[PDB]
Amino acid sequence: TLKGQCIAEFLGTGLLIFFGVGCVAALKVAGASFGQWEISVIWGLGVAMAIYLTAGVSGAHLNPAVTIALWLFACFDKRKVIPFIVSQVAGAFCAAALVYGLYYNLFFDFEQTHHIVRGSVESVDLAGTFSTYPNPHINFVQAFAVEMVITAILMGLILALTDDGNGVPRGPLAPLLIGLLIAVIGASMGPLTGFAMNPARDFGPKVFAWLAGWGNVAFTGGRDIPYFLVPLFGPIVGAIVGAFAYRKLIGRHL
Amino acid sequence: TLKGQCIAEFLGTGLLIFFGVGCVAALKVAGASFGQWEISVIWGLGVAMAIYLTAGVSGAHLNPAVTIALWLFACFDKRKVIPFIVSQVAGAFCAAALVYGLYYNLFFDFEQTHHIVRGSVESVDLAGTFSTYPNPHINFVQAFAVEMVITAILMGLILALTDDGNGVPRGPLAPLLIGLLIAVIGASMGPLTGFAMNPARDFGPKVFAWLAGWGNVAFTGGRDIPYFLVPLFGPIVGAIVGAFAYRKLIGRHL
Amino acid sequence: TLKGQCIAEFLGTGLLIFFGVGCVAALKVAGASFGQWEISVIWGLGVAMAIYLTAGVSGAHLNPAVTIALWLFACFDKRKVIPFIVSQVAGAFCAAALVYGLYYNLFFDFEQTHHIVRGSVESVDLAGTFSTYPNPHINFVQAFAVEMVITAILMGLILALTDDGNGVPRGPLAPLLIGLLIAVIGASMGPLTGFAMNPARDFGPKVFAWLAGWGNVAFTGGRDIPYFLVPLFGPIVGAIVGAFAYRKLIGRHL
Amino acid sequence: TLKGQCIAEFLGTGLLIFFGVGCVAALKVAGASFGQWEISVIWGLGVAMAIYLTAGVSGAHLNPAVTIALWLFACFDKRKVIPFIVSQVAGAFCAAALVYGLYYNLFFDFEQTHHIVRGSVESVDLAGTFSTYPNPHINFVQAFAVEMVITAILMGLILALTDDGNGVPRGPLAPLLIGLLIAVIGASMGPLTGFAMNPARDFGPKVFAWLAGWGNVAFTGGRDIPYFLVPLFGPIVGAIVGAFAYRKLIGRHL
Ligand SMILES: CCCCCCCCO[C@@H]1O[C@H](CO)[C@@H](O)[C@H](O)[C@H]1O
Ligand SMILES: CCCCCCCCO[C@@H]1O[C@H](CO)[C@@H](O)[C@H](O)[C@H]1O
Ligand SMILES: CCCCCCCCO[C@@H]1O[C@H](CO)[C@@H](O)[C@H](O)[C@H]1O
Ligand SMILES: CCCCCCCCO[C@@H]1O[C@H](CO)[C@@H](O)[C@H](O)[C@H]1O
Ligand SMILES: CCCCCCCCO[C@@H]1O[C@H](CO)[C@@H](O)[C@H](O)[C@H]1O
Ligand SMILES: CCCCCCCCO[C@@H]1O[C@H](CO)[C@@H](O)[C@H](O)[C@H]1O
Ligand SMILES: CCCCCCCCO[C@@H]1O[C@H](CO)[C@@H](O)[C@H](O)[C@H]1O
Ligand SMILES: CCCCCCCCO[C@@H]1O[C@H](CO)[C@@H](O)[C@H](O)[C@H]1O
């Protein structure tokens, strides 16, 4: 039932963001010690749990880029395309809100302690608690390239791991392995754009931050070209390229 | 045999606290390097081991909140409800005592080194070695909300992971995955209330600390409203809400 | 064939020490960043690998305390008892030697840099690279208690994990889980005595350190009562107590 | 089809280097916090993913030393030997290039910030981002010994883990376990030579660094004897010794 699938996608994506934005809020406003690998592994395992919870129902896309790619390469009913995306983005929105609710006091106290004007350019750092932003040394096109390449690897490997005709089937290991993949991607490329590779994961929370007092910098990141466009279309282009790559270079030889 | 189940629950919950309070004592009074994720993963894996050890006998509840929820939603014999809880809380008590025994010298030396009067408000930090306390910036109601939300996610996901009708069965992976779930919960929400989500895990050791010279602050946390009430009823309310949520939003669509 | 089993035990125990003493040498004389959990997880996974390699042949005891316990409670041929132990201790000896060989230069340079006289009381720290020593604040009897309690938990849980009549069988997961158990034990109790819980793991390398210029302090640890006696008999007493505990409190109710 | 196998090997080895060189670039020029175990576990899991992706096709050698050893001890068609190696080294080359592309700006900014002349002896540190180099305190022969011993353990354990006649078969766990093995090897021996143990993994990226402005020091490491020769032939000699060791000391007794 399509209604039960949209619900799962809503809970899955939200669950996913709950852990991700949560551990990052603890790092930013709670003074918790986290390394590049810790933040990555937590994001990865969060997604792994999000999958185990919703896989049996919606198939656990929990990613607009993934939904679109499966539609164009995995025979995924297009009628279910938009419903999924609207659910995925909605869950990411609510999750970010919920995480903000539990960390409410820590955000305000932190900003007062370090004289941070929420909404200003200098506040983009705490805004990074919800969505991704470009590294200081790279630009729009560079950031678009990174998100594209990584999402391709994500989609490409997801298919490989889920492809039962590829080596010994992983069975119940697939979800966990997909989480570890996300872990290593965020540890090797994270410093560049925050390994968004999920339109819903970035736009949803971004919209929340925008409402939560961060204003326009939540979308722009304090740059000339509105940054939100990168985590929005970058993952999509990559998810397709990656999906195509697997089918040709690997699938065709199985 | 109910007697053999209460024993398992006693050993399981104790084993669980042994690792948890143990790694936290090493962090607090042993000067060991631990990050928010390390402490969380150790707690998670400790519970994972506690499950593998007692699952085959008592079903491995090792959590009053869980026992009650299974009673109201998993057809768990109510006659076994109180016996379990009394065993779970007892094990947590003994474990905390045992951990204190092995770390005896380190506690006293630490307090002398940093002029800490055990029992005073400033000693709540070392008291945190046994039970959970609220973050400085949040209050009673806020702390109750956090514990409630997380325990709901705990119960909700536990059912999902153990639900054989939900995607590929995890089999022997279930326990480990439940531990990783606890890991990501403590890393994303830990800084707020110490992710207690287990009445026995918090009250048992709390009672020990109270006897061990920490006095009343072990229960109050140095606040107006006795804090021990949050980790006591907060998890219970959440465990039910979570259990209900899974049955409706997910189970009903499987 | 008993000869092929002693070889496996020799390679297993050695492999085990290779990773353990290796990561600890990198921490002590290589300036590598390791936390209490990292060192523990590396020791745990090293043992996990040591098991996968020798389990199919010798049964992978890789621990004198374990061999003795299996003899008294798992119907392990006593004729194979001494042969195993002599092999296990021999492997630990060679491994420690090999690790010292690869880290040769780093040890001498470190000692010169920090004016450390190998063999003196202050050199026990680098001697800790091979075997375990008591925490500054605890004494002989305290250290004996710690090693005893933990080894009991080790043996107790090993049986539980390997007991196919206890919940869902772990199959190929058993070894890994036994490694994670060792990981959480070393993270919760490590700071006290270095979680030796393996006579061969401590005595073998200790004898090497003694020959490598560390002298008598390698055995005494710079204390009144020769410390080597704790990691020697402490684990044995615990391995038995633990083995007994499982059979009674858990096995008898399966 | 040999063409489809060379492609897999090209993608596998590249994928492998993508994560490895990637996380190390984040550590060196992105200021990311990584410990000796984190870098090791990321390298290990990267290889684990590289295997799951290509195992079903090429058998996932992803290592010249491994290919040669399987040829001499696993009945691996020699006709496929060179094709594999040329593919493996090519993938490592491209991967290193790709990683450099995404981190382009960070490298130049870092060098300017810390006045580092790319190509000079002091630039070997950033060159370490792509290939391995010897620890300051050890020499050519010492470095050759280390790489040899570890690669032997790698090959030896790989066979053990993949040997279905050795204890309970690991099935879909094999790849992950091989990654964890690489993890513990890099954490115990890493500080000595960067646990290359893969001719393609070191030479490929080394050639890239050489073209990328690092010049001759990329091959020499700033030493008398050209260092690149160690990660080139060291792993090969060890891979054979290790392969032989397993067949004799373990295989012969199964
Ligand atoms: C789930 C529905 C959530 C709707 C958005 C709630 C956002 C609450 O966020 C609030 O936004 C205000 C407006 O900028 C700010 O002034 C406050 O500081 C901020 O707390
Ligand atoms: C499913 C996601 C669809 C996204 C469509 C584009 C939404 C763009 O969002 C817009 O960005 C502008 C630029 O900063 C802001 O000025 C506007 O307030 C904001 O609404
Ligand atoms: C398993 C049974 C344990 C019973 C409780 C033992 C507590 C020992 O704890 C002791 O408590 C004393 C009283 O406050 C303090 O004065 C001591 O400092 C403290 O070590
Ligand atoms: C199963 C757990 C039941 C718990 C029932 C409530 C126990 C409350 O405990 C009480 O808290 C008071 C307030 O700090 C203290 O003054 C008392 O000494 C203490 O006994
Ligand atoms: C595998 C067989 C190994 C035998 C022991 C070799 C120990 C080498 O160790 C050496 O011991 C000497 C004697 O104290 C010291 O003077 C040297 O500094 C030390 O390197
Ligand atoms: C299988 C292990 C058997 C160990 C038997 C006891 C070995 C004790 O070892 C002895 O310890 C003494 C005290 O420091 C030293 O003076 C001696 O040199 C040393 O040989
Ligand atoms: C995939 C094909 C890649 C071919 C090699 C590209 C190397 C680009 O690297 C460039 O090399 C130049 C020459 O040293 C340097 O001057 C530049 O600083 C460096 O960016
Ligand atoms: C498959 C790998 C084959 C490697 C063959 C040896 C390549 C050596 O490479 C050479 O090293 C010299 C010494 O620094 C440099 O001067 C040369 O520029 C370089 O081409």
Short mmCIF file of N, CA and C in Angstrom, two decimals, chain A residues 16-127:
data_model
loop_
_atom_site.label_atom_id
_atom_site.label_comp_id
_atom_site.label_asym_id
_atom_site.label_seq_id
_atom_site.Cartn_x
_atom_site.Cartn_y
_atom_site.Cartn_z
N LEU A 16 16.97 8.51 10.13
CA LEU A 16 18.28 8.75 9.55
C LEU A 16 18.81 10.12 9.99
N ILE A 17 18.05 11.20 9.74
CA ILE A 17 18.47 12.57 10.12
C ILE A 17 18.57 12.78 11.64
N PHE A 18 17.72 12.07 12.39
CA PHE A 18 17.72 12.16 13.84
C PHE A 18 19.14 11.88 14.36
N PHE A 19 19.72 10.76 13.96
CA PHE A 19 21.07 10.41 14.38
C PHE A 19 22.14 11.34 13.78
N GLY A 20 22.06 11.58 12.48
CA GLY A 20 23.02 12.45 11.84
C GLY A 20 23.07 13.87 12.42
N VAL A 21 21.96 14.60 12.36
CA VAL A 21 21.91 15.97 12.88
C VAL A 21 22.13 15.97 14.40
N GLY A 22 21.74 14.87 15.02
CA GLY A 22 21.89 14.74 16.45
C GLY A 22 23.33 14.70 16.90
N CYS A 23 24.14 13.82 16.31
CA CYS A 23 25.55 13.69 16.70
C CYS A 23 26.34 14.93 16.30
N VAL A 24 25.89 15.60 15.24
CA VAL A 24 26.56 16.81 14.79
C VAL A 24 26.21 18.00 15.67
N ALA A 25 25.03 17.96 16.30
CA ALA A 25 24.62 19.04 17.20
C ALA A 25 25.39 18.91 18.50
N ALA A 26 25.69 17.66 18.89
CA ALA A 26 26.44 17.37 20.11
C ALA A 26 27.88 17.81 19.93
N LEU A 27 28.36 17.70 18.70
CA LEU A 27 29.72 18.11 18.35
C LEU A 27 29.83 19.64 18.33
N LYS A 28 28.84 20.29 17.71
CA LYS A 28 28.85 21.74 17.57
C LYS A 28 28.46 22.54 18.81
N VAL A 29 27.33 22.20 19.43
CA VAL A 29 26.84 22.94 20.59
C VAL A 29 26.87 22.20 21.92
N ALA A 30 27.36 20.96 21.93
CA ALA A 30 27.41 20.22 23.19
C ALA A 30 28.85 19.95 23.61
N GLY A 31 29.79 20.37 22.79
CA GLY A 31 31.19 20.17 23.11
C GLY A 31 31.64 18.72 23.18
N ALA A 32 30.94 17.84 22.46
CA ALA A 32 31.27 16.42 22.43
C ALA A 32 32.46 16.17 21.50
N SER A 33 33.34 15.23 21.85
CA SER A 33 34.51 14.90 21.03
C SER A 33 34.19 13.92 19.95
N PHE A 34 34.31 14.38 18.71
CA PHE A 34 34.05 13.57 17.53
C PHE A 34 35.10 13.84 16.45
N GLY A 35 35.56 12.78 15.81
CA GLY A 35 36.54 12.95 14.75
C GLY A 35 35.80 12.85 13.43
N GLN A 36 36.51 13.02 12.32
CA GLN A 36 35.90 12.92 10.99
C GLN A 36 35.31 11.51 10.75
N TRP A 37 35.95 10.49 11.30
CA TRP A 37 35.49 9.11 11.13
C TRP A 37 34.31 8.79 12.04
N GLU A 38 34.32 9.34 13.25
CA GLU A 38 33.22 9.11 14.19
C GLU A 38 31.91 9.67 13.64
N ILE A 39 31.93 10.93 13.21
CA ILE A 39 30.74 11.57 12.64
C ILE A 39 30.25 10.78 11.43
N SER A 40 31.19 10.31 10.62
CA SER A 40 30.87 9.52 9.44
C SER A 40 30.25 8.16 9.79
N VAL A 41 30.84 7.47 10.75
CA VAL A 41 30.34 6.15 11.12
C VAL A 41 28.97 6.25 11.77
N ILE A 42 28.74 7.34 12.48
CA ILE A 42 27.45 7.53 13.13
C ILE A 42 26.39 7.80 12.06
N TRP A 43 26.75 8.56 11.03
CA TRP A 43 25.82 8.86 9.96
C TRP A 43 25.52 7.57 9.23
N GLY A 44 26.58 6.81 8.94
CA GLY A 44 26.44 5.55 8.25
C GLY A 44 25.55 4.55 8.97
N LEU A 45 25.82 4.33 10.25
CA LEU A 45 25.02 3.40 11.05
C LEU A 45 23.60 3.91 11.25
N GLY A 46 23.41 5.22 11.20
CA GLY A 46 22.07 5.73 11.38
C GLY A 46 21.22 5.34 10.19
N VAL A 47 21.83 5.44 9.01
CA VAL A 47 21.16 5.10 7.76
C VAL A 47 20.93 3.60 7.75
N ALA A 48 21.89 2.85 8.27
CA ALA A 48 21.79 1.39 8.33
C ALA A 48 20.56 0.97 9.12
N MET A 49 20.29 1.67 10.21
CA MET A 49 19.13 1.41 11.06
C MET A 49 17.86 1.86 10.34
N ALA A 50 17.96 3.00 9.64
CA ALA A 50 16.82 3.54 8.90
C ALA A 50 16.35 2.54 7.85
N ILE A 51 17.30 1.79 7.28
CA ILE A 51 17.02 0.78 6.28
C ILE A 51 16.36 -0.45 6.92
N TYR A 52 16.97 -1.01 7.95
CA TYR A 52 16.39 -2.17 8.60
C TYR A 52 14.94 -1.95 9.03
N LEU A 53 14.61 -0.71 9.33
CA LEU A 53 13.28 -0.36 9.80
C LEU A 53 12.25 -0.25 8.70
N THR A 54 12.65 0.30 7.56
CA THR A 54 11.72 0.52 6.46
C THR A 54 11.91 -0.34 5.21
N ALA A 55 13.00 -1.09 5.14
CA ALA A 55 13.24 -1.89 3.95
C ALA A 55 12.09 -2.82 3.61
N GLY A 56 11.63 -3.56 4.62
CA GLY A 56 10.55 -4.51 4.42
C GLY A 56 9.25 -3.94 3.90
N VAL A 57 9.07 -2.63 4.01
CA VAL A 57 7.84 -1.99 3.56
C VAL A 57 8.02 -1.22 2.26
N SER A 58 8.64 -0.04 2.35
CA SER A 58 8.85 0.81 1.19
C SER A 58 10.04 0.44 0.34
N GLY A 59 10.88 -0.48 0.81
CA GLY A 59 12.08 -0.84 0.06
C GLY A 59 13.25 0.01 0.56
N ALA A 60 12.92 0.93 1.47
CA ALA A 60 13.86 1.86 2.10
C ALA A 60 14.74 2.69 1.16
N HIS A 61 14.13 3.56 0.35
CA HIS A 61 14.91 4.43 -0.54
C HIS A 61 15.54 5.48 0.37
N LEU A 62 14.70 6.18 1.12
CA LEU A 62 15.17 7.19 2.06
C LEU A 62 16.11 8.19 1.40
N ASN A 63 15.99 8.33 0.08
CA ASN A 63 16.85 9.24 -0.69
C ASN A 63 16.22 9.54 -2.06
N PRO A 64 15.88 10.82 -2.31
CA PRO A 64 15.28 11.21 -3.58
C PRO A 64 16.16 10.76 -4.76
N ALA A 65 17.46 11.02 -4.67
CA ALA A 65 18.40 10.64 -5.73
C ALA A 65 18.31 9.14 -6.01
N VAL A 66 18.21 8.35 -4.95
CA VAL A 66 18.08 6.91 -5.09
C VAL A 66 16.73 6.52 -5.74
N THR A 67 15.64 7.14 -5.29
CA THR A 67 14.30 6.86 -5.82
C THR A 67 14.25 7.08 -7.32
N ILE A 68 14.76 8.23 -7.76
CA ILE A 68 14.81 8.58 -9.17
C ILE A 68 15.66 7.56 -9.94
N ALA A 69 16.85 7.25 -9.44
CA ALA A 69 17.72 6.28 -10.10
C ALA A 69 17.05 4.90 -10.24
N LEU A 70 16.39 4.42 -9.18
CA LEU A 70 15.70 3.13 -9.24
C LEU A 70 14.55 3.19 -10.25
N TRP A 71 13.95 4.36 -10.37
CA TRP A 71 12.87 4.54 -11.32
C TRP A 71 13.38 4.39 -12.75
N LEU A 72 14.51 5.02 -13.04
CA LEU A 72 15.09 4.96 -14.36
C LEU A 72 15.93 3.71 -14.64
N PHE A 73 16.31 2.95 -13.61
CA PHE A 73 17.14 1.78 -13.86
C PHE A 73 16.74 0.51 -13.11
N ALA A 74 15.80 0.61 -12.18
CA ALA A 74 15.40 -0.57 -11.43
C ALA A 74 13.91 -0.85 -11.57
N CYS A 75 13.30 -0.29 -12.61
CA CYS A 75 11.88 -0.53 -12.85
C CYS A 75 10.98 -0.12 -11.68
N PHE A 76 11.32 0.99 -11.04
CA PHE A 76 10.55 1.49 -9.91
C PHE A 76 9.38 2.31 -10.43
N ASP A 77 8.17 1.89 -10.04
CA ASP A 77 6.93 2.56 -10.45
C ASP A 77 7.07 4.07 -10.34
N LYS A 78 6.89 4.77 -11.45
CA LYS A 78 7.01 6.22 -11.43
C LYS A 78 5.88 6.89 -10.68
N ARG A 79 4.75 6.20 -10.56
CA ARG A 79 3.63 6.78 -9.85
C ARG A 79 4.00 7.00 -8.39
N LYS A 80 4.90 6.16 -7.90
CA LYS A 80 5.35 6.25 -6.51
C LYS A 80 6.54 7.20 -6.32
N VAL A 81 7.08 7.74 -7.41
CA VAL A 81 8.22 8.64 -7.34
C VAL A 81 7.98 9.88 -6.49
N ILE A 82 7.09 10.76 -6.91
CA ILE A 82 6.82 11.98 -6.15
C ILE A 82 6.34 11.72 -4.72
N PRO A 83 5.39 10.78 -4.54
CA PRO A 83 4.91 10.51 -3.17
C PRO A 83 6.09 10.23 -2.22
N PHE A 84 7.03 9.39 -2.66
CA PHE A 84 8.22 9.04 -1.88
C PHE A 84 9.01 10.30 -1.52
N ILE A 85 9.42 11.05 -2.53
CA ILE A 85 10.20 12.27 -2.32
C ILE A 85 9.54 13.24 -1.35
N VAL A 86 8.25 13.47 -1.53
CA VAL A 86 7.56 14.38 -0.64
C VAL A 86 7.60 13.87 0.79
N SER A 87 7.61 12.55 0.95
CA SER A 87 7.65 11.93 2.28
C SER A 87 9.05 12.02 2.86
N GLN A 88 10.04 11.69 2.03
CA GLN A 88 11.42 11.72 2.45
C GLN A 88 11.82 13.12 2.91
N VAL A 89 11.51 14.14 2.12
CA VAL A 89 11.86 15.51 2.48
C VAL A 89 11.10 15.96 3.73
N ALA A 90 9.87 15.49 3.88
CA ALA A 90 9.05 15.84 5.03
C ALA A 90 9.66 15.26 6.31
N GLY A 91 10.09 14.00 6.25
CA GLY A 91 10.68 13.36 7.39
C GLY A 91 11.96 14.05 7.82
N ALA A 92 12.79 14.42 6.86
CA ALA A 92 14.05 15.11 7.14
C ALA A 92 13.74 16.45 7.83
N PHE A 93 12.66 17.09 7.40
CA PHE A 93 12.26 18.37 7.98
C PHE A 93 11.87 18.21 9.46
N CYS A 94 10.96 17.27 9.73
CA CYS A 94 10.48 17.01 11.06
C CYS A 94 11.60 16.58 12.00
N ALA A 95 12.45 15.68 11.51
CA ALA A 95 13.59 15.16 12.28
C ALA A 95 14.46 16.33 12.73
N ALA A 96 14.87 17.17 11.78
CA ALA A 96 15.71 18.33 12.09
C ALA A 96 15.03 19.19 13.17
N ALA A 97 13.71 19.34 13.04
CA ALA A 97 12.94 20.12 14.00
C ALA A 97 13.02 19.48 15.37
N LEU A 98 12.80 18.16 15.42
CA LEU A 98 12.83 17.40 16.66
C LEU A 98 14.19 17.47 17.33
N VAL A 99 15.24 17.30 16.54
CA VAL A 99 16.60 17.39 17.06
C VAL A 99 16.84 18.80 17.63
N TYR A 100 16.32 19.82 16.95
CA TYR A 100 16.48 21.20 17.41
C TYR A 100 15.73 21.39 18.74
N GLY A 101 14.59 20.72 18.86
CA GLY A 101 13.78 20.80 20.06
C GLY A 101 14.49 20.28 21.29
N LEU A 102 15.13 19.13 21.14
CA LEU A 102 15.86 18.51 22.24
C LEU A 102 17.14 19.26 22.56
N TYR A 103 17.71 19.95 21.57
CA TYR A 103 18.96 20.69 21.78
C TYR A 103 18.73 22.19 21.86
N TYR A 104 17.46 22.60 21.89
CA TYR A 104 17.06 24.00 21.97
C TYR A 104 18.00 24.90 22.80
N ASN A 105 18.07 24.63 24.11
CA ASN A 105 18.87 25.41 25.04
C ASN A 105 20.35 25.50 24.71
N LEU A 106 20.93 24.39 24.27
CA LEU A 106 22.34 24.37 23.91
C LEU A 106 22.67 25.30 22.73
N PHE A 107 21.75 25.43 21.78
CA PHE A 107 21.99 26.32 20.64
C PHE A 107 22.02 27.77 21.09
N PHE A 108 21.02 28.19 21.85
CA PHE A 108 20.97 29.58 22.30
C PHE A 108 22.10 29.96 23.24
N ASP A 109 22.45 29.06 24.15
CA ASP A 109 23.51 29.31 25.10
C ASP A 109 24.85 29.42 24.38
N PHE A 110 25.08 28.53 23.41
CA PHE A 110 26.32 28.54 22.63
C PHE A 110 26.50 29.87 21.90
N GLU A 111 25.44 30.31 21.21
CA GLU A 111 25.46 31.56 20.44
C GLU A 111 25.72 32.78 21.32
N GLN A 112 25.22 32.74 22.56
CA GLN A 112 25.40 33.84 23.48
C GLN A 112 26.83 33.82 24.02
N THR A 113 27.31 32.62 24.33
CA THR A 113 28.66 32.43 24.85
C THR A 113 29.72 32.91 23.89
N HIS A 114 29.56 32.59 22.61
CA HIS A 114 30.52 32.98 21.58
C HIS A 114 30.00 34.13 20.73
N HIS A 115 29.15 34.97 21.30
CA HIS A 115 28.58 36.10 20.57
C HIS A 115 28.34 35.81 19.09
N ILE A 116 27.42 34.89 18.82
CA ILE A 116 27.08 34.51 17.45
C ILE A 116 25.66 34.98 17.11
N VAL A 117 25.55 35.83 16.10
CA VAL A 117 24.25 36.35 15.67
C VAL A 117 23.62 35.36 14.68
N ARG A 118 22.64 34.60 15.13
CA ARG A 118 22.00 33.64 14.24
C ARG A 118 21.41 34.37 13.05
N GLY A 119 21.84 33.97 11.86
CA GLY A 119 21.34 34.57 10.64
C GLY A 119 22.46 35.26 9.90
N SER A 120 23.52 35.59 10.62
CA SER A 120 24.67 36.25 10.03
C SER A 120 25.52 35.24 9.29
N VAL A 121 26.54 35.72 8.59
CA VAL A 121 27.42 34.83 7.85
C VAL A 121 28.19 33.90 8.79
N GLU A 122 28.57 34.42 9.95
CA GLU A 122 29.32 33.64 10.90
C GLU A 122 28.50 32.55 11.56
N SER A 123 27.18 32.57 11.35
CA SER A 123 26.31 31.57 11.97
C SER A 123 26.13 30.34 11.10
N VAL A 124 26.69 30.38 9.90
CA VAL A 124 26.56 29.26 8.97
C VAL A 124 27.18 28.01 9.58
N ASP A 125 28.15 28.21 10.47
CA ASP A 125 28.79 27.09 11.14
C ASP A 125 27.77 26.27 11.94
N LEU A 126 26.97 26.93 12.77
CA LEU A 126 25.96 26.20 13.55
C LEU A 126 24.84 25.72 12.66
N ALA A 127 24.63 26.41 11.52
CA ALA A 127 23.59 26.03 10.55
C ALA A 127 24.00 24.70 9.91
#
